[PDB]
Amino acid sequence: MQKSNKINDALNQHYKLNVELGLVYAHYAHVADDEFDMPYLGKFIQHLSEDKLGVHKEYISDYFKRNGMKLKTDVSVAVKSIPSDAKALIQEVYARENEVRDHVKAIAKLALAEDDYESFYFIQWYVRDGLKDLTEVDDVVKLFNSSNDKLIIEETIKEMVE
Amino acid sequence: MQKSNKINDALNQHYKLNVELGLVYAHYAHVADDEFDMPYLGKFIQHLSEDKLGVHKEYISDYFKRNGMKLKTDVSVAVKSIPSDAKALIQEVYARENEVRDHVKAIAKLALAEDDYESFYFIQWYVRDGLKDLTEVDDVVKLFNSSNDKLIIEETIKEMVE
Amino acid sequence: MQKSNKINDALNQHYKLNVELGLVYAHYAHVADDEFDMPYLGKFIQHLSEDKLGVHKEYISDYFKRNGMKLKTDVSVAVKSIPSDAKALIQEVYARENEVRDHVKAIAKLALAEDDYESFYFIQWYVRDGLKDLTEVDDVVKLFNSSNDKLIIEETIKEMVE
Amino acid sequence: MQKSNKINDALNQHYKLNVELGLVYAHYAHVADDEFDMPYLGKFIQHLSEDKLGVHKEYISDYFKRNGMKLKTDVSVAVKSIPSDAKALIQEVYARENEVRDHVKAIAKLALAEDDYESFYFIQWYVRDGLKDLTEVDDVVKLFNSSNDKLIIEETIKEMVE
Amino acid sequence: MQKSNKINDALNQHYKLNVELGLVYAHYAHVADDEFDMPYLGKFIQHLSEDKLGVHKEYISDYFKRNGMKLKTDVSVAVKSIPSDAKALIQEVYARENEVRDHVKAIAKLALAEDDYESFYFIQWYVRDGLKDLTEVDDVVKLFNSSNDKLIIEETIKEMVE
Amino acid sequence: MQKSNKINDALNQHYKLNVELGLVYAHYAHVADDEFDMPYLGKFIQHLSEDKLGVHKEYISDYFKRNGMKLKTDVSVAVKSIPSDAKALIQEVYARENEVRDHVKAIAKLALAEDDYESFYFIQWYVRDGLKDLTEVDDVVKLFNSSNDKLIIEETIKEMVE
Amino acid sequence: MQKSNKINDALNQHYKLNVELGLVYAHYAHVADDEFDMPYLGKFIQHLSEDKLGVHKEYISDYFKRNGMKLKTDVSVAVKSIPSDAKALIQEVYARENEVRDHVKAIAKLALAEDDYESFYFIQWYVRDGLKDLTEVDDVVKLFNSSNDKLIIEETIKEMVE
Ligand SMILES: [Fe+3]
Ligand SMILES: [Fe+3]
Ligand SMILES: [Fe+3]
Ligand SMILES: [Fe+3]
Ligand SMILES: [Fe+3]
Ligand SMILES: [Fe+3]
Ligand SMILES: [Fe+3]
Ligand SMILES: [Fe+3]
Ligand SMILES: [Fe+3]
Ligand SMILES: [Fe+3]
Ligand SMILES: [Fe+3]
Ligand SMILES: [Fe+3]
Ligand SMILES: [Fe+3]
Ligand SMILES: [Fe+3]
Ligand SMILES: [Fe+3]
Ligand SMILES: [Fe+3]
Ligand SMILES: [Fe+3]
Ligand SMILES: [Fe+3]
Ligand SMILES: [Fe+3]
Ligand SMILES: [Fe+3]
Ligand SMILES: [Fe+3]
Ligand SMILES: [Fe+3]
Ligand SMILES: [Fe+3]
Ligand SMILES: [Fe+3]
Ligand SMILES: [Fe+3]
Ligand SMILES: [Fe+3]
Ligand SMILES: [Fe+3]
Ligand SMILES: [Fe+3]
Ligand SMILES: [Fe+3]
Ligand SMILES: [Fe+3]
Ligand SMILES: [Fe+3]
Ligand SMILES: [Fe+3]
Ligand SMILES: [Fe+3]
Ligand SMILES: [Fe+3]
Ligand SMILES: [Fe+3]
Ligand SMILES: [Fe+3]
Ligand SMILES: [Fe+3]
Ligand SMILES: [Fe+3]
Ligand SMILES: [Fe+3]
Ligand SMILES: [Fe+3]
Ligand SMILES: [Fe+3]
Ligand SMILES: [Fe+3]
Ligand SMILES: [Fe+3]
Ligand SMILES: [Fe+3]
Ligand SMILES: [Fe+3]
Ligand SMILES: [Fe+3]
Ligand SMILES: [Fe+3]
Ligand SMILES: [Fe+3]
């Protein structure tokens, strides 16, 4: 029956987070290619950008249509400083994906507290994807600690963003 | 040789405009489906959203990589009121696409003033797409003035967003 | 280990509800076609009837075989008045599907209370299908509020029950 | 021309009989598998259940649409005791199918008495299927009198419900 | 964020249980074939052995890599007495699979207590497989109570471990 | 004719050695991936684990069925310290495979001493595989002495564990 | 109508520039392979040589045939010193491609000044190719600043001049 307002707000914020994250990553992808001369790192980060700005926000929008929750569009993001090198750039992406896992955990917890079993279900996809996206990112961070050669690292990323 | 700062700013603003427009349309697509019961109108507007948030912003980002212009990410958009009915919604989309045509005209004009023939070229795509997107939108507005039946109109949009 | 009697009763009632619902819809499908001259509405409602009388009851019966819960067959249903028009008919179907969502929510809640994680799992399918069936039904109700032409509406349903 | 009320009532009862029979068999199929460890016997009886709850009731509903007879849905069935073993279970199914043959004979006889040659025709399908379903059932009963080995019997049923 | 130590220990024990179970079943498969002259029973039990020693332990190992839980390898198992006949052998396997269902239930319960929604998800696979493996095993136990002929039973198992 | 007890014991120990080795390697594969960031090294070592826990133990179990030797399952293995780096890890694996070659040599020697020409034959497979597995391992050890770049080494292992 | 002499001279010089550039690059390709042991760098530079000596000069020659401009062949080029290493070699190629962009910009500017809209069109291809060729070259220069290993760099160029 009736929609939970708490869940509605929590999913609107997550909508907001995926929009703004995806806009940050689109900038980070540009810089990976341009300043840092790592176009495959940039193609890995652009695919993560399109992920956040696509299905991560689409599923919420579609879910709201089915249960009567209200969509809210309030976006504010400015990319004001860039990490100093490619390593720090991908470590930054990592840190935001770890925060994704913490936010979706709060939403699952709330859904059980509300007895919103439809929302707990809806969020199970995000529960899993939080770890998948974090793992894929972690697989790139590891590269910068396994070789000091930008072109070696780039050649390895190629086989990941194929 | 040297990048024109005026063109750099003008293309950063157009980047900003396409991001924010595409975020507005993604909301407008939701409402077309949800409140107004017109899922094909919503699929037409979601495709326009993905257009603005995809190649419209990607081409600028890629162009900047080739000539040395600096990418700027500063986004601010809140969807605070929605048009009252489907007709007004698509008329609103129309009005923004007409403003797109005026903004790209300013950029072409500036590129000639700067003797930036690479930028005049780059913008020729946007020159044409301004009219194409406006025409496609206009083809939907016309529908609301040609029949008073939501389901008739919807069935016609289907053959456009195929 | 040991089967929860509470869950056994709750799933027997849901078995009962799907049988009786599916028998009501089979009658409602007939009337949609016969009295109301809407054979596609009738084919939409007959497919929902076969859904409830098929996998909705089969999954419970099969689940009981695996865990030792006892099947109970006690059916009582009489279709004693019919809604006055096609709109009211599909609105009636809607109202019962909304009650399905409330009943499956009670079963998920109980399964957690009982620490019956096998039953919480089994019910996740019903958790999702409650919203899917309700959405599909809602997509038909919307039609009667979007056009006053029976044949227009019928032509739209055709593309849903394909 | 005008519909015979006697035939209308006789076909409504047969509708009722097929619904309730099919609900009994769905329970009997469960028990064949669960208690009696004979899943192929259970698959034979589930197919007979779906037969009664499908085309046996659908043909009447569809026939009524063509001639103006009124559909009646009044169902009452409770499965309150189960036969003691698989043999007795299939003998029970047999006895109900023999009663099907007697009921359809009454309807053919009445249709001639009423000079309802459309209804005599419609019922010819049921005239034949009464003997076919009874024969298929009889082919399973014979198995329990031809071998004392549950797994031998099961392996034979497999080639019937293929 | 931070890994739950309780969950880490509970999943290490389950790792241990699947290793040792799979080593017991590999022995039980040998005996089913050798002493008891039932090679298909032995092929059913060898497939269950490879299941426990494969994906049942691999998924935990892979999950630990993604979240930072520590893998522990401490194995101790000796097969010191064998059941007296094939029936008792498969009943023994049954009893261990029923204990699997109880252990995974404890892990799901703990994951909710810890608000480890990633671990509750990870375990949902084990929640379902506990019942699937138990059912498949139960389907073999039933055979020894449905016929007194070893070769009849063997021929039936063949169609299960195909 | 009669089974040699000495050979029976020697093959039971080799059974034990392959089980426990394969359990150690499954842990070593995890660590290669997790701690050392070398997933292809980990995939090489996991394939060696599955080799030891599969056909290396299966062939003995199957051989015992044919000649009447008794299978013994007594397993004890705990992984209590891990080598400090990837190089030392693969050197450790090497050292155990060299001990495999010494153990199978003892079994061939004993089989001739016993005039067990069936067992000498059975062991010829292990005679050859001792050198093959050792060579494949040696091909990985050589990598750590041929380049100081983890990602270079990883890319080479990829073409071996294809 | 009448051909612009200014445009005729400007396009004859560009003809001259592409001939002489392409002859320089053919020498630079030889040296990349021979002295510097980088055959893929040499294959990248030979393809750029054939580009300048092919379509870059052919399009002008063909354009002159259509509008009545006079072809002039006056070539003077001697390769008298070579850059000291592969890096400096590709940086040299870069610097000449940047001068190409400046020369074609002068021709576009002149064509507008002359109201030679056919020549402005003809040159739009060169406007774009100036940036494309420069970008491809820049993608090779970046390699020498991303790794100190000639064979690593060579392996990367391979995937560009495929
Ligand atoms: Fe609120
Ligand atoms: Fe992806
Ligand atoms: Fe909405
Ligand atoms: Fe960098
Ligand atoms: Fe609660
Ligand atoms: Fe994702
Ligand atoms: Fe390489
Ligand atoms: Fe400026
Ligand atoms: Fe388009
Ligand atoms: Fe840039
Ligand atoms: Fe509207
Ligand atoms: Fe000018
Ligand atoms: Fe567009
Ligand atoms: Fe139409
Ligand atoms: Fe009770
Ligand atoms: Fe369906
Ligand atoms: Fe049962
Ligand atoms: Fe009506
Ligand atoms: Fe609890
Ligand atoms: Fe359903
Ligand atoms: Fe139409
Ligand atoms: Fe009457
Ligand atoms: Fe049939
Ligand atoms: Fe009727
Ligand atoms: Fe029985
Ligand atoms: Fe008569
Ligand atoms: Fe039948
Ligand atoms: Fe047979
Ligand atoms: Fe601890
Ligand atoms: Fe399996
Ligand atoms: Fe680990
Ligand atoms: Fe036995
Ligand atoms: Fe809690
Ligand atoms: Fe399993
Ligand atoms: Fe047989
Ligand atoms: Fe001995
Ligand atoms: Fe191998
Ligand atoms: Fe044996
Ligand atoms: Fe290491
Ligand atoms: Fe001898
Ligand atoms: Fe081997
Ligand atoms: Fe390579
Ligand atoms: Fe002149
Ligand atoms: Fe080219
Ligand atoms: Fe000429
Ligand atoms: Fe060099
Ligand atoms: Fe002019
Ligand atoms: Fe070119």
How far is ligand 41, taken at its centre, from the CA of residue F131, in Å? Answer: 9
> Residue A60 is encoded by which pair of tokens?
């919420």
Nearest-neighbour CA in chain B from C138: distance (Å): 10
**Cα torsion through F4, F6, F8, F11, rounded to 10:** -130
> Residue F95 is encoded by which pair of tokens?
């050292």
φ, ψ of residue B76 in degrees (nearest 5): -150, 115
Q: Reduced to 3 states, what is the DSSP secondary structure of residue D26?
A: helix
Q: Reduced to 3 states, what is the DSSP secondary structure of residue A79?
A: coil
Cα separation values, G39 from A2, G83, G141, G151, Å? 70, 16, 16, 10
Residue D90 near residue D141 (C-beta atoms within 8 A)? yes
**E115 contacts A127? CB cut-off 8 A:** no
**C149 contacts B149? CB cut-off 8 A:** yes
Per the DSSP assignment, residues forming a β-bridge with E75 are F77
For residues E16 and E73, give the distance between their C-alpha atoms in angstroms, rounded to a whole number.
7
**B19 contacts A64? CB cut-off 8 A:** no
Cβ-based contacts of E135 with chain D (< 8 Å) = none
Can you state the percent helix, strand and coil of chain B, rounding each to 5? 75, 5, 20
Nearest-neighbour CA in chain E from D76: distance (Å): 34
> Residue A98 is encoded by which pair of tokens?
């770890």
> Residue G68 is encoded by which pair of tokens?
């009545």
> Residue A46 is encoded by which pair of tokens?
């652009």
Among E128, E132, E125, smallest CA distance to E58 is for: E125
Q: Among A66, A112, A117, whose Cβ lies nearest the Cβ of C105?
A: A117
Residue D151 near residue E153 (C-beta atoms within 8 A)? yes
Q: Residue B75 belongs to what H/E stretch?
A: strand B74-78
Q: Which residue of F has its CA nearest to A157?
A: F151
Nearest-neighbour CA in chain C from D151: distance (Å): 19
Residue C15 near residue C79 (C-beta atoms within 8 A)? no
Instruction: Characterize the bridge pairing of strands C74-78 and D74-78.
Output: antiparallel
The reply to whether A152 touches chain F by the CB within 8 Å rule is: yes
For residues E99 and G6, give the distance between their C-alpha atoms in angstroms, rounded to a whole number.
93
How far is ligand 45, taken at its centre, from the CA of residue G50, in Å? Answer: 23
The residues, ordered by sequence, that sit 6+ positions from G93 with a Cβ below 8 Å of its Cβ are G25, G28, G45, G48, G137
Residue G51 near residue G100 (C-beta atoms within 8 A)? no
Q: Reduced to 3 states, what is the DSSP secondary structure of residue C135?
A: helix
Residue with the two structure tokens 């950063």: B12
Q: Which residue of C has its CA nearest to E126?
A: C118
> Residue G76 is encoded by which pair of tokens?
């003077």
Listed residues: CB within 5 A of ion ligand 36: F 5
Cβ-based contacts of D74 with chain C (< 8 Å) = 78-79
Please compute, for residue D121, the number of CA atoms within 13 A of its CA located in the half-sphere on the CB side. Answer: 4
| Helices B117-144 and G117-144, packing angle to 10 deg | 110
How far is ligand 48, taken at its centre, from the CA of residue B54, in Å? Answer: 28
Ligand in closest contact with the CA of A6: 1
Cβ-based contacts of B33 with chain A (< 8 Å) = 65
Residue window 83-102, chain E: list those with CB within 8 Å of chain A: none
Q: Specify the DSSP class assigned to residue D4.
A: P
Q: Residue C13 belongs to what H/E stretch?
A: helix C5-34
**C117 contacts E131? CB cut-off 8 A:** no
The reply to whether B131 touches chain A by the CB within 8 Å rule is: no
Cα separation values, F83 from D39, E74, F28, F31, F32, Å? 54, 17, 9, 10, 10
Residue E42 near residue E146 (C-beta atoms within 8 A)? no
How far is ligand 25, taken at its centre, from the CA of residue D36, in Å? Answer: 4
The reply to whether A31 touches chain B by the CB within 8 Å rule is: yes
Nearest-neighbour CA in chain F from E79: distance (Å): 5
The reply to whether C125 touches chain A by the CB within 8 Å rule is: no
For residues D138 and D128, give the distance between their C-alpha atoms in angstroms, rounded to a whole number.
15
Among G80, G72, G74, smallest CA distance to G24 is for: G80
Resolution (A): 2.5
The reply to whether E67 touches chain A by the CB within 8 Å rule is: yes
How many Cβ atoms sit within 10 Å of the Cβ of residue G115?
A: 9
**B67 contacts G131? CB cut-off 8 A:** yes
Q: Which residue of E has its CA nearest to A109?
A: E115
Cβ-based contacts of A112 with chain C (< 8 Å) = 112
Cβ-based contacts of D24 with chain C (< 8 Å) = 73
Listed residues: CB within 5 A of ion ligand 38: E 34; F 64
Tell me, letter by letter, the H, E, C secondary structure of chain F.
CCCCHHHHHHHHHHHHHHHHHHHHHHHHHHHHHHCCCCHHHHHHHHHHHHHHHCHHHHHHHHHHHHHCCCCCCEEEEECCCCCCCHHHHHHHHHHHHHHHHHHHHHHHHHHHHHCCHHHHHHHHHHHHHHHHHHHHHHHHHHHHCCCCCHHHHHHHHHCCCC
For residue F22, is it left (φ>0), alpha (ψ between -120 and 50) or beta?
alpha
Angle at F19 (CA atoms; ends F15, F22), nearest 5 degrees: 135
Angle at G152 (CA atoms; ends G148, G157), nearest 5 degrees: 115
Nearest-neighbour CA in chain C from A66: distance (Å): 6
Q: Among A112, A124, A135, whose Cβ lies nearest the Cβ of E66?
A: A135
Tell me, letter by letter, the H, E, C secondary structure of chain E.
CCCCHHHHHHHHHHHHHHHHHHHHHHHHHHHHHHCCCCHHHHHHHHHHHHHHHCHHHHHHHHHHHHHCCCCCCEEEEECCCCCCCHHHHHHHHHHHHHHHHHHHHHHHHHHHHHCCHHHHHHHHHHHHHHHHHHHHHHHHHHHHCCCCCHHHHHHHHHCCCC
For residues D28 and D94, give the distance between their C-alpha atoms in angstroms, rounded to a whole number.
12
Is chain A in touch with chain G: ≥3 Cβ pairs within 8 A? yes
How far is ligand 11, taken at its centre, from the CA of residue B85, in Å? Answer: 4
**E79 contacts F33? CB cut-off 8 A:** no
> Residue G53 is encoded by which pair of tokens?
């000596």
Q: Residue G56 belongs to what H/E stretch?
A: helix G55-67
Cβ-based contacts of A118 with chain C (< 8 Å) = 101, 105, 127-128, 130-131
| Helices G39-53 and G150-158, packing angle to 10 deg | 40
Mutate to test the interface with D, among E147, E148, E158 (most CBs of D within 10 A): E147
Among G16, G24, G25, G18, smallest CA distance to G55 is for: G18
> Residue B145 is encoded by which pair of tokens?
């003035």
Per the DSSP assignment, residues forming a β-bridge with B74 are A78
For residues C12 and D123, give the distance between their C-alpha atoms in angstroms, rounded to a whole number.
36
Ligand in closest contact with the CA of B53: 13
Nearest-neighbour CA in chain F from E13: distance (Å): 13
Ligand in closest contact with the CA of G37: 46
Method of determination? X-ray
The reply to whether A155 touches chain G by the CB within 8 Å rule is: yes
> Residue G94 is encoded by which pair of tokens?
């870069």
Q: Reduced to 3 states, what is the DSSP secondary structure of residue A77?
A: strand
Cα separation values, F86 from C39, C93, E71, Å? 70, 64, 17
- What is the DSSP track for C62-114? HHHHHHTPPP--EEEEE-----SSHHHHHHHHHHHHHHHHHHHHHHHHHHHHH
Nearest-neighbour CA in chain D from E144: distance (Å): 10
H helices of B54-149, in order, are 55-67, 86-114, 117-144
Ligand in closest contact with the CA of G114: 47
Position B105: which residue type?
K
Nearest-neighbour CA in chain B from A74: distance (Å): 4
Residue with the two structure tokens 């032509």: C155
Helices (H) and strands (E) in chain D, counts: 6, 1
